[PDB]
Amino acid sequence: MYQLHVRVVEAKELPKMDTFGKCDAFAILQLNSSRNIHRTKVIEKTYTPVWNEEFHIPLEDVTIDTLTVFLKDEDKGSSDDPISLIKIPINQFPLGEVVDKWYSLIPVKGVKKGGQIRLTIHIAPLGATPFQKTD
Ligand SMILES: [Cl-]
Numbered sequence: 346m347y348q349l350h351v352r353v354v355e356a357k358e359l360p361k362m363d364t365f366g367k368c369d370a371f372a373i374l375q376l377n378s379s380r381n382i383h384r385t386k387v388i389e390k391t392y393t394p395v396w397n398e399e400f401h402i403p404l405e406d407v408t409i410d411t412l413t414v415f416l417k418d419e420d421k422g423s424s425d426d427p428i429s430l431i432k433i434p435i436n437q438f439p440l441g442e443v444v445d446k447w448y449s450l451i452p453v454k455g456v457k458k459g460g461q462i463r464l465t466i467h468i469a470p471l472g473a474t475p476f477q478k479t480d
């Protein structure tokens with residue numbers, strides 16, 4: 346009955362993945378290893394993508410669940426090209442609080458920089474208003 350509200354706000358300091366242009370970045374969110382897998386839109390040709398997209402993900406156990414965030418470059422022939430990732434424990438957010446923070450993405454092998462991503466995260470009972478403190 347707890348919901349993870351995650352606003353994938355923006356990222357910065359992304360790598361130039363190819364000689365032809367800037368990154369076409371999008372983010373994938375996954376709860377644990379479950380089927381709850383969400384994707385943002387692709388922002389074409391920028392190192393500072395701004396998505397400002399909200400996702401509402403039902404949670405299984407707020408003491409152990411993990412959110413994986415995986416930043417990738419849109420498929421241009423070789424599948425989506427991984428940039429970087431982070432695994433965020435759900436238990437580090439006080440229940441009911443709206444937490445707006447930057448996170449350091451770990452670049453995958455062969456990638457020169459991982460980027461930094463801003464997420465606003467709010468875990469609340471599913472009937473509460475998302476992205477407002479649950480007093
Ligand atoms: Cl182009």
Ligand SMILES: [Cl-]
Pocket residue numbers: 397398399400
């Ligand atoms: Cl939205």
